[PDB]
Write a protein that binds this DNA or RNA. Structure first.
Lengths: 100, 150, 129, 205, 123, 82, 80, 65
RNA sequence: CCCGCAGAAGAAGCACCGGCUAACUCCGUGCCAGCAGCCGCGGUAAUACGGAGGGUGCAAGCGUUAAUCGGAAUUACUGGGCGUAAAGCGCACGCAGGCGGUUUGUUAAGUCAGAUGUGAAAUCCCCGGGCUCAACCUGGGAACUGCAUCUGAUACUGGCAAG
């Protein structure tokens, strides 16, 4: 039961399936009695440098209050699924619901 | 950096015992682009010193605008002498629409989309500073809350 | 003939706010006190009292935030020459919602911000701005 | 129903490159671009507000080779659609089949790319199309017929297409000489200098 | 401008009648020219302008400026009426169409060749 | 004679043969009673060019409205399922 | 109940019928001022009961004469 | 002077991009606190942000990518 | 509609270039000839006349004329004014009409809510489908801002009774 910051990018050609993913991801946190604090979709933002060749990947931001074992499984799910590239999971001291 | 732009140039004249001498007047407006506008109007016998005096007078008598992200807060009617001014915020995807003398005041205000219509006098000196009213006496939600209590 | 006792009273606010007076003074009716409540709960006035029984009077204490007036542009709308009657949905929003329009609906008088969710309109009295 | 006159004068009037030449030779060597065409082209314009309004309207018209009456319904379709009207016309302009063929690079010029579509030589979704202004929906596979396949115009056009951007919203494949229309392009993809706001205020009056 | 005065009598805007009384709002009409003559224009300007009165086939007898460099119009000829006010000559508000019916086009004109009724020379 | 008649509403050489409850003496493309469906004889590979509402036509023959030959072809083409 | 209207009786002396003034408070379609628009309707009754200054309720019926397709049903305030 | 000792910032947010552009030289490196005058406390949370921001490629590592 | 023949081969004009309004120079004309939607140009140095070059704007169309709306808030219901620009009757009384202090109770006409029926189809708008695209055809929804009826509310106006 701890607050985390989750940001992951998506391959641009798989942009149409992204609303399913947070819908699929929120079934994992709230399914595991956690809760969602901030959802926002940054869209196809141009990156400063190319990763796996490519340009203008799709960014997704998420603030999560959950226990750590489920978020371990999402980290594997980012590793397992090819469509998500360059994920990052952090840590926030308190729950945050702000802009930007 | 405050968006130097001119509006109109006019030629005015004197009559004297020798005859008729001429002079030129320049209309300019400036503004940082985030809720702040200064307007100027200068006169000289030649055109470039008139604009010089116009931009220099524009970068004083500073008036701020209570502004949202890219547009206004409410409809407000602006009058001065003979010109009547209508302004109305529009959608974010819409651009700005106005008259030519109604134009250049608005981009230097930071407003990006307003249904603006000029009424009565179309005089460029008169429609400007009539648009400043409305922007000058503009009411924002946070300070009317302080004006009332909530 | 003094032919709109309401339309006198909003001008008392207009003349009181412009002259920066402390209080305004006008005979009272029930509808006069009714919109006096609406000005109170929106913070456009501080206190109103009803005094007298043989000739009742309504006493209003105006407001001056930064010294200048609090009421800015107040306008009677439903005048005896032309009564304005609008339904629940086409009630306009004053100052794009930052101001309010008091309205005599069938269930009572209130602002526009109280009538639209309640789902009933009536006499569009005035907009306070 | 095309301009079909001298091409570099159109680039000379606008003053910039309008991609109406293949790029085999530098445009500075081909024409004296720095001044406008004609006898009086070197003079100062002092152009009016409507002048740069109109010059921006002709400009975007002349890369894509689209006439004014066809340009108007392009704006009218963009006006009736949702979203911002400025990029919507740019989205609609990029949907042209000759523009798509050039954007994937089968044509040396978009006038040359228009001739590929006109001369019964382009197959989309396994269907041949003659109309140059065919709007391309997403997930549409463009291709070439058996004729104009391994023909000298479409080989030389491909070799000069490598030095350009190779745009993101299309999947070019020179090995089988085809491609797919993956997504509609956005405003951030196309050269970032087209004053689309000047476009709107010309048709808003 | 009181509303009680407006219900009793509504707002009335005048019709602002047509500049040219070309009958039945027809865009052209033919007519027989009676007298061809020349006239001096209004005060700021000066010329010897070619004008004719024409009896229209509708019945009206009005005047009309005949344009172009020179002409070969006589009495009883039938010409087309075009319209358009000539402000330098008071009274005449109509034009004739060059190259139509008995009216000939303008000899050897190149610019505005369509509007002056001249055929395209071979090029 | 209230009948079940078939009307032509399509473009030139591309007929969209609309079926419609119409009076006998009225025009083919003119006045009628109500719409129950259509028939598009130049339909695509997908089958939606011939749609009828079986309930409304059944009430009309139950009312006493005679039907013509071509509408009789449409009901006996869809039969009950296909 | 049935469709009925209530208006002021405008005449006093017509043979076994009456004209009744129906008064309305409709809105003007352009300027919006609420004005009094009255209509006078020929109304039948037996042996001429009602009179001037009276208010009656009238109902729609079959045509019995020219403009007289109505008949009253009940009288109220038969006094000046 | 330091901008972050005033304005009451609890911790520097890496998702706020506009401030970080001002504090990075155009080549891509982190400028020192000896130039901007940032407090040594706030420079430490600052420098972690660009390392975090470069990971999601919001900020370039070098100018020669 | 598909396949094959031959070869750039069978296929570009129209208006404008003084300002409004995009595009300027030369020659002839010399208040003549003429142009002109308005301002105005031409009386021996015309970016405004006629020709030429060049440019601009459209395009199998381009211009002129006519016609409606817009701009015109220039009949101002939304949304104008009446001292000097047009406009307060020369001044009163006064029928109709318009409107009306203040409180109690009644009524529910105006008014407001809800429901029902209707507002034909076609047209407009939105989401789709087919003609190689488009125009065009067409599925479904929305809309049809209105009308009548029925049931409720009585803040105000209206009516009634009493102060």
């Amino acid at each position: 039961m701890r607050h985390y910051e989750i940001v992951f990018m998506v391959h641009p050609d798989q942009s149409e399936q992204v609303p399913g993913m947070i819908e699929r991801y929120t079934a994992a946190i709230t399914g595991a009695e956690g809760k969602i604090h901030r959802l926002e979709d940054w869209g196809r933002r141009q990156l400063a440098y190319p990763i796996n060749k490519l340009h203008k990947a799709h960014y997704v931001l998420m603030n999560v209050e959950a226990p750590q074992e489920v978020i371990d499984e999402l980290e594997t799910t980012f590793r397992f699924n090819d469509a998500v590239i360059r994920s990052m999971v952090m840590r926030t001291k308190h729950a945050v619901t702000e802009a930007s | 950096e405050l968006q130097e732009k001119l509006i109109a140039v006019n030629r005015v004249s004197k009559t004297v015992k020798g005859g008729r001498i001429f002079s030129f007047t320049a209309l300019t407006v400036v503004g940082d682009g985030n809720g702040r506008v200064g307007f100027g109007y200068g006169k000289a016998r030649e055109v470039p010193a008139a604009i010089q005096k116009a931009m220099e007078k524009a970068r004083r008598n500073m008036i701020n605008v209570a502004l949202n992200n890219g547009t206004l807060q409410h409809p407000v009617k602006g009058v001065h002498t003979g010109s009547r001014v209508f302004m109305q915020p529009a959608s974010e995807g819409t651009g700005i629409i106005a008259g030519g003398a109604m134009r250049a005041v608005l981009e230097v205000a930071g407003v990006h989309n307003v249904l603006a219509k000029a009424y009565g006098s179309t005089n460029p000196i008169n429609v400007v500073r009539a648009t400043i009213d409305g922007l000058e006496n503009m009411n924002s939600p946070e300070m009317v809350a302080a004006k009332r209590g909530k | 003939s003094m032919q709109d006792p309401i339309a006198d009273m909003l001008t008392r606010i207009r003349n009181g706010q412009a002259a920066n007076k402390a209080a305004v003074t006008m005979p009272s009716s029930k509808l006069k006190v009714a919109i006096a409540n609406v000005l109170k709960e929106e913070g456009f006035i501080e206190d109103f009292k009803v005094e007298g029984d043989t000739k009742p009077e309504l006493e209003l204490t105006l407001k001056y935030f930064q010294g200048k007036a609090v009421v800015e542009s107040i306008q009677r709308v439903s005048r005896p020459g032309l009564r304005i009657y609008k339904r629940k949905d086409e009630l306009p929003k004053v100052m794009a919602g930052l101001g309010i329009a008091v309205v005599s609906t069938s269930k009572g008088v209130m602002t526009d911000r109280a009538a639209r969710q309640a789902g009933l309109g009536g006499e569009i009295i005035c907009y306070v701005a | 129903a095309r301009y079909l006159g001298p091409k570099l004068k159109l680039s000379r009037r606008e003053g910039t490159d309008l991609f109406l030449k293949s790029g085999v030779r530098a445009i500075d060597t081909k024409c004296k671009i720095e001044q406008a065409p004609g006898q009086h082209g070197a003079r100062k314009p002092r152009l009016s507000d409507y002048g740069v309004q109109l010059r921006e309207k002709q400009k975007v018209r002349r890369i894509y080779g689209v006439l004014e009456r066809q340009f108007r319904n392009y704006y009218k379709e963009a006006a009736r659609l949702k979203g911002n009207t400025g990029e919507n016309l740019l989205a609609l302009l990029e949907g042209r089949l000759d523009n798509v063929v050039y954007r994937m690079g089968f044509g040396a010029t978009r006038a040359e790319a228009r001739q590929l579509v006109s001369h019964k030589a382009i197959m989309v979704n396994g269907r041949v199309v003659n109309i140059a202004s065919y709007q391309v929906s997403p997930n549409d596979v463009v291709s070439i017929r058996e004729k104009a396949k391994k023909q000298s115009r479409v080989k030389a056009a491909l070799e000069l297409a490598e030095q350009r951007e190779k745009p993101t919203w299309l999947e070019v494949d020179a090995g089988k000489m085809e491609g797919t229309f993956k997504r509609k392009p956005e405003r951030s993809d196309l050269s970032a200098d087209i004053n689309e706001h000047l476009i709107v205020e010309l048709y808003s009056k | 401008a009181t509303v009680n005065q407006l219900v009793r009598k509504p707002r009335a805007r005048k019709v602002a009648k047509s500049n040219v009384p070309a009958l039945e709002a027809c865009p052209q009409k033919r007519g027989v020219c009676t007298r061809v003559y020349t006239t001096t224009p209004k005060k700021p300007n000066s010329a010897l302008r070619k004008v004719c009165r024409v009896r229209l086939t509708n019945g009206f007898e009005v005047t009309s400026y005949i344009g172009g460099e020179g002409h070969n119009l006589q009495e009883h000829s039938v010409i087309l009426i075009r319209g358009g006010r000539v402000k330098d000559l008071p009274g005449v508000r109509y034009h004739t169409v060059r190259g139509a019916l008995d009216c000939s086009g303008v000899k050897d004109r190149k610019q505005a060749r369509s509007k002056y009724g001249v055929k395209r020379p071979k090029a | 004679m209230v009948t079940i008649r078939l009307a032509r509403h399509g473009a030139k050489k591309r007929p969209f043969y609309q079926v419609v409850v119409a009076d006998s003496r009225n025009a083919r493309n003119g006045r009628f009673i109500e719409r129950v469906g259509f028939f598009n004889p130049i339909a695509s590979e997908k089958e939606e060019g011939t749609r009828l509402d079986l309930d409304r036509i059944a009430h009309w023959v139950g009312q006493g409205a005679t039907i013509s030959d071509r509408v009789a072809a449409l009901i006996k083409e869809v039969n009950k399922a296909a | 109940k049935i469709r009925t209207l209530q208006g002021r009786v405008v005449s006093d002396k017509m043979e076994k019928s009456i004209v009744v003034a129906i008064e309305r408070f409709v809105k003007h379609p352009i300027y919006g001022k609420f004005i009094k628009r009255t209509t006078k309707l020929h109304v039948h009754d037996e042996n001429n009961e009602c009179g001037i200054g009276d208010v009656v309720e009238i109902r729609e019926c079959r045509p019995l004469s020219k403009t007289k397709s109505w008949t009253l049903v009940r009288v109220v305030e038969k006094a000046v | 002077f330091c901008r972050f000792t005033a304005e009451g910032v609890q911790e520097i947010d890496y998702k706020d991009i506009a401030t970080l552009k001002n504090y990075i030289t155009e080549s891509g490196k982190i400028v020192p606190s000896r130039i901007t005058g940032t407090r040594a406390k706030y420079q430490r949370q600052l420098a972690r942000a660009i390392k975090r921001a470069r990971y999601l490629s919001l900020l370039p590592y070098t100018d020669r990518h």
